[PDB]
Design a protein around this ligand. Structure first.
Ligand SMILES: CSCC[C@H](N)C(O)(O)c1nccs1
Ligand SMILES: [Co+2]
Ligand SMILES: [Co+2]
Ligand SMILES: [Co+2]
Length: 249
Protein backbone atom coordinates (compact mmCIF):
# COMPACT_ATOMS: atom_id res chain seq x y z
CA UNK A 1 0.00 0.00 0.00
CA UNK A 2 0.86 3.68 -0.06
CA UNK A 3 0.75 5.28 3.40
CA UNK A 4 -1.08 8.61 3.33
CA UNK A 5 -2.18 9.21 6.93
CA UNK A 6 -0.66 9.09 10.39
CA UNK A 7 -3.35 6.57 11.34
CA UNK A 8 -2.34 4.15 8.60
CA UNK A 9 1.27 4.54 9.72
CA UNK A 10 0.32 3.82 13.31
CA UNK A 11 -1.65 0.72 12.27
CA UNK A 12 1.31 -0.56 10.28
CA UNK A 13 3.75 0.05 13.14
CA UNK A 14 1.40 -1.76 15.53
CA UNK A 15 1.13 -4.97 13.51
CA UNK A 16 4.81 -4.75 12.62
CA UNK A 17 5.69 -4.67 16.29
CA UNK A 18 3.47 -7.66 16.99
CA UNK A 19 5.04 -9.73 14.22
CA UNK A 20 8.55 -8.79 15.37
CA UNK A 21 7.67 -9.70 18.96
CA UNK A 22 6.30 -13.07 17.86
CA UNK A 23 9.29 -13.70 15.59
CA UNK A 24 11.78 -12.91 18.39
CA UNK A 25 9.92 -15.02 20.95
CA UNK A 26 9.71 -18.02 18.61
CA UNK A 27 13.39 -17.76 17.67
CA UNK A 28 14.36 -17.55 21.33
CA UNK A 29 12.33 -20.68 22.08
CA UNK A 30 13.90 -22.67 19.24
CA UNK A 31 16.13 -25.38 20.71
CA UNK A 32 16.83 -29.08 20.18
CA UNK A 33 13.82 -31.10 21.31
CA UNK A 34 11.00 -28.65 20.65
CA UNK A 35 8.55 -29.38 17.83
CA UNK A 36 7.68 -26.80 15.20
CA UNK A 37 4.05 -27.10 16.29
CA UNK A 38 5.09 -26.10 19.79
CA UNK A 39 6.82 -23.05 18.32
CA UNK A 40 3.68 -22.27 16.30
CA UNK A 41 1.65 -22.38 19.49
CA UNK A 42 3.67 -19.42 20.77
CA UNK A 43 2.38 -17.37 17.84
CA UNK A 44 -1.15 -18.60 18.50
CA UNK A 45 -1.01 -17.31 22.06
CA UNK A 46 0.78 -13.96 21.29
CA UNK A 47 -1.48 -13.19 18.30
CA UNK A 48 -4.46 -13.67 20.62
CA UNK A 49 -2.85 -11.55 23.33
CA UNK A 50 -2.15 -8.65 20.95
CA UNK A 51 -5.45 -8.87 19.06
CA UNK A 52 -3.87 -9.85 15.75
CA UNK A 53 -4.65 -12.73 13.43
CA UNK A 54 -2.43 -14.98 11.35
CA UNK A 55 -2.02 -13.78 7.77
CA UNK A 56 -1.26 -17.29 6.45
CA UNK A 57 -4.53 -18.62 7.93
CA UNK A 58 -6.53 -15.55 6.91
CA UNK A 59 -5.23 -14.79 3.39
CA UNK A 60 -4.29 -18.32 2.31
CA UNK A 61 -6.00 -20.81 4.69
CA UNK A 62 -2.51 -22.08 5.57
CA UNK A 63 -2.55 -24.93 8.12
CA UNK A 64 -0.56 -23.05 10.76
CA UNK A 65 -0.27 -19.66 12.46
CA UNK A 66 3.18 -19.19 10.92
CA UNK A 67 5.45 -20.83 8.36
CA UNK A 68 8.35 -22.78 9.83
CA UNK A 69 10.79 -24.29 7.38
CA UNK A 70 13.69 -26.57 8.36
CA UNK A 71 16.83 -27.68 6.47
CA UNK A 72 15.60 -29.02 3.13
CA UNK A 73 12.61 -26.69 3.45
CA UNK A 74 13.19 -23.07 2.45
CA UNK A 75 9.73 -21.53 2.83
CA UNK A 76 6.09 -22.30 3.57
CA UNK A 77 6.92 -25.14 5.98
CA UNK A 78 3.93 -26.48 7.93
CA UNK A 79 4.39 -26.55 11.70
CA UNK A 80 4.12 -30.17 12.82
CA UNK A 81 5.41 -32.90 15.05
CA UNK A 82 8.83 -32.39 13.45
CA UNK A 83 11.40 -32.01 16.25
CA UNK A 84 14.21 -29.46 16.04
CA UNK A 85 17.69 -30.94 16.26
CA UNK A 86 21.16 -29.52 16.92
CA UNK A 87 22.52 -27.90 13.77
CA UNK A 88 19.16 -27.33 12.11
CA UNK A 89 18.79 -24.37 9.76
CA UNK A 90 15.40 -22.94 10.65
CA UNK A 91 13.34 -20.26 8.97
CA UNK A 92 10.53 -18.68 10.94
CA UNK A 93 8.21 -16.47 8.89
CA UNK A 94 5.59 -14.45 10.78
CA UNK A 95 2.87 -12.41 9.05
CA UNK A 96 -0.41 -11.11 10.42
CA UNK A 97 -3.08 -8.43 10.33
CA UNK A 98 -4.73 -6.21 12.90
CA UNK A 99 -7.48 -3.67 12.23
CA UNK A 100 -7.06 -4.32 8.51
CA UNK A 101 -3.32 -3.69 8.27
CA UNK A 102 -0.53 -6.18 7.70
CA UNK A 103 3.08 -6.92 8.50
CA UNK A 104 5.40 -9.66 7.26
CA UNK A 105 8.78 -10.68 8.62
CA UNK A 106 11.07 -13.68 8.83
CA UNK A 107 14.45 -14.88 9.97
CA UNK A 108 16.69 -17.85 9.31
CA UNK A 109 19.10 -19.02 12.00
CA UNK A 110 21.15 -22.02 13.05
CA UNK A 111 20.17 -24.02 16.10
CA UNK A 112 23.30 -24.48 18.20
CA UNK A 113 26.19 -25.81 16.14
CA UNK A 114 26.12 -27.46 12.75
CA UNK A 115 29.09 -29.45 11.46
CA UNK A 116 28.94 -27.29 8.33
CA UNK A 117 29.72 -23.57 8.64
CA UNK A 118 27.85 -22.93 5.36
CA UNK A 119 24.56 -22.92 7.29
CA UNK A 120 25.61 -19.86 9.29
CA UNK A 121 27.25 -18.34 6.21
CA UNK A 122 24.02 -18.12 4.25
CA UNK A 123 22.43 -16.55 7.33
CA UNK A 124 25.24 -14.01 7.57
CA UNK A 125 24.94 -13.13 3.89
CA UNK A 126 21.13 -12.90 3.94
CA UNK A 127 21.46 -10.25 6.66
CA UNK A 128 24.03 -8.39 4.55
CA UNK A 129 21.83 -8.65 1.45
CA UNK A 130 18.88 -7.14 3.29
CA UNK A 131 21.01 -4.29 4.63
CA UNK A 132 22.44 -3.64 1.18
CA UNK A 133 18.98 -3.76 -0.38
CA UNK A 134 17.46 -1.16 1.91
CA UNK A 135 20.45 1.17 1.59
CA UNK A 136 19.05 1.68 -1.91
CA UNK A 137 15.50 2.58 -0.85
CA UNK A 138 14.04 6.06 -1.38
CA UNK A 139 11.22 7.67 -3.39
CA UNK A 140 12.01 7.56 -7.10
CA UNK A 141 14.51 4.73 -6.97
CA UNK A 142 14.15 1.70 -9.21
CA UNK A 143 12.49 -1.33 -7.66
CA UNK A 144 15.05 -3.41 -9.54
CA UNK A 145 17.89 -1.83 -7.57
CA UNK A 146 16.72 -4.02 -4.68
CA UNK A 147 17.31 -7.23 -6.62
CA UNK A 148 20.54 -5.86 -8.03
CA UNK A 149 21.87 -5.31 -4.49
CA UNK A 150 20.71 -8.72 -3.25
CA UNK A 151 22.30 -10.61 -6.13
CA UNK A 152 25.49 -8.55 -5.96
CA UNK A 153 25.83 -9.40 -2.27
CA UNK A 154 25.33 -13.08 -3.03
CA UNK A 155 27.95 -13.04 -5.78
CA UNK A 156 30.45 -11.16 -3.60
CA UNK A 157 30.26 -14.10 -1.21
CA UNK A 158 30.31 -16.96 -3.70
CA UNK A 159 26.62 -17.66 -3.12
CA UNK A 160 23.39 -17.70 -5.06
CA UNK A 161 19.89 -16.35 -4.76
CA UNK A 162 16.58 -18.16 -5.01
CA UNK A 163 15.22 -16.60 -8.19
CA UNK A 164 11.63 -17.87 -7.92
CA UNK A 165 10.89 -16.53 -4.47
CA UNK A 166 10.19 -12.80 -4.16
CA UNK A 167 9.19 -9.95 -1.95
CA UNK A 168 6.00 -8.01 -2.47
CA UNK A 169 3.94 -5.01 -1.59
CA UNK A 170 2.18 -5.41 1.73
CA UNK A 171 -0.25 -3.39 3.82
CA UNK A 172 -3.97 -3.89 3.21
CA UNK A 173 -3.27 -7.50 2.25
CA UNK A 174 -0.37 -9.93 2.58
CA UNK A 175 0.52 -9.59 -1.10
CA UNK A 176 -0.20 -6.45 -3.19
CA UNK A 177 1.66 -4.13 -5.62
CA UNK A 178 4.42 -4.26 -6.41
CA UNK A 179 3.68 -7.93 -7.14
CA UNK A 180 7.26 -9.21 -7.04
CA UNK A 181 10.40 -7.80 -5.51
CA UNK A 182 13.09 -9.90 -7.17
CA UNK A 183 16.36 -11.13 -5.71
CA UNK A 184 18.13 -10.28 -8.95
CA UNK A 185 18.27 -7.48 -11.51
CA UNK A 186 15.71 -7.15 -14.31
CA UNK A 187 17.05 -4.61 -16.82
CA UNK A 188 13.60 -4.01 -18.30
CA UNK A 189 11.77 -3.04 -15.13
CA UNK A 190 11.06 0.67 -14.85
CA UNK A 191 8.89 0.38 -11.73
CA UNK A 192 9.82 2.96 -9.10
CA UNK A 193 9.45 3.17 -5.35
CA UNK A 194 7.30 6.05 -4.18
CA UNK A 195 6.85 8.03 -0.99
CA UNK A 196 4.80 5.97 1.46
CA UNK A 197 5.17 2.67 -0.37
CA UNK A 198 5.18 -0.42 1.90
CA UNK A 199 7.24 -3.42 0.81
CA UNK A 200 8.15 -6.78 2.19
CA UNK A 201 11.79 -7.28 1.24
CA UNK A 202 12.97 -10.85 1.74
CA UNK A 203 16.28 -11.93 0.21
CA UNK A 204 16.71 -15.71 -0.02
CA UNK A 205 20.42 -16.64 -0.14
CA UNK A 206 21.39 -20.15 -1.25
CA UNK A 207 24.54 -22.27 -0.97
CA UNK A 208 23.90 -23.74 -4.44
CA UNK A 209 20.40 -24.02 -5.92
CA UNK A 210 19.02 -20.96 -7.73
CA UNK A 211 15.35 -21.95 -7.32
CA UNK A 212 12.94 -23.97 -5.19
CA UNK A 213 10.50 -26.73 -6.08
CA UNK A 214 7.41 -28.37 -4.59
CA UNK A 215 8.34 -30.24 -1.41
CA UNK A 216 6.99 -32.99 0.82
CA UNK A 217 3.45 -31.59 0.80
CA UNK A 218 1.19 -29.07 -0.93
CA UNK A 219 2.79 -26.08 0.80
CA UNK A 220 6.52 -26.50 1.49
CA UNK A 221 9.14 -25.23 -0.91
CA UNK A 222 12.36 -27.22 -0.91
CA UNK A 223 15.51 -27.81 -2.88
CA UNK A 224 16.14 -31.33 -4.13
CA UNK A 225 19.88 -30.81 -3.68
CA UNK A 226 19.25 -29.83 -0.05
CA UNK A 227 20.95 -26.48 -0.45
CA UNK A 228 21.26 -24.36 2.66
CA UNK A 229 19.08 -21.30 2.18
CA UNK A 230 18.55 -18.34 4.50
CA UNK A 231 15.97 -15.58 4.49
CA UNK A 232 15.78 -12.22 6.19
CA UNK A 233 12.48 -10.39 5.77
CA UNK A 234 11.17 -7.06 7.00
CA UNK A 235 8.25 -4.82 6.23
CA UNK A 236 9.62 -1.50 5.05
CA UNK A 237 8.07 1.92 4.41
CA UNK A 238 9.73 4.13 1.82
CA UNK A 239 10.05 7.72 3.06
CA UNK A 240 11.95 10.83 2.06
CA UNK A 241 13.83 10.53 5.35
CA UNK A 242 14.80 6.90 4.75
CA UNK A 243 13.27 3.43 5.16
CA UNK A 244 11.14 2.71 8.21
CA UNK A 245 11.06 -0.95 9.23
CA UNK A 246 7.83 -1.76 11.03
CA UNK A 247 9.15 -5.20 11.98
CA UNK A 248 12.49 -4.15 13.47
CA UNK A 249 12.58 -3.62 17.23
C1 LIG B 1 2.29 -18.80 2.60
S1 LIG B 1 1.68 -17.34 3.22
C2 LIG B 1 3.33 -16.81 3.78
C3 LIG B 1 4.08 -15.94 2.77
C4 LIG B 1 5.41 -15.43 3.32
N1 LIG B 1 5.05 -14.60 4.46
C5 LIG B 1 6.27 -14.60 2.36
O1 LIG B 1 5.47 -13.66 1.66
O2 LIG B 1 7.25 -13.90 3.12
C6 LIG B 1 7.03 -15.50 1.40
N2 LIG B 1 7.01 -15.26 0.09
C7 LIG B 1 7.78 -16.19 -0.57
C8 LIG B 1 8.37 -17.06 0.32
S2 LIG B 1 8.01 -16.77 1.95
CO1 LIG C 1 6.99 -13.71 5.16
CO1 LIG D 1 6.62 -12.34 2.21
CO1 LIG E 1 5.17 -14.17 -0.23
Amino acid sequence: MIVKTEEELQALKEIGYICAKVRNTMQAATKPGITTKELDNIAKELFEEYGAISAPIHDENFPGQTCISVNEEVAHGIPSKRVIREGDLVNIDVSALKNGYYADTGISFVVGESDDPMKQKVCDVATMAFENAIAKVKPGTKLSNIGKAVHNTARQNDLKVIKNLTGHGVGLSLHEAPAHVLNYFDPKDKTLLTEGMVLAIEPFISSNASFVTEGKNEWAFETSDKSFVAQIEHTVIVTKDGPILTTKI
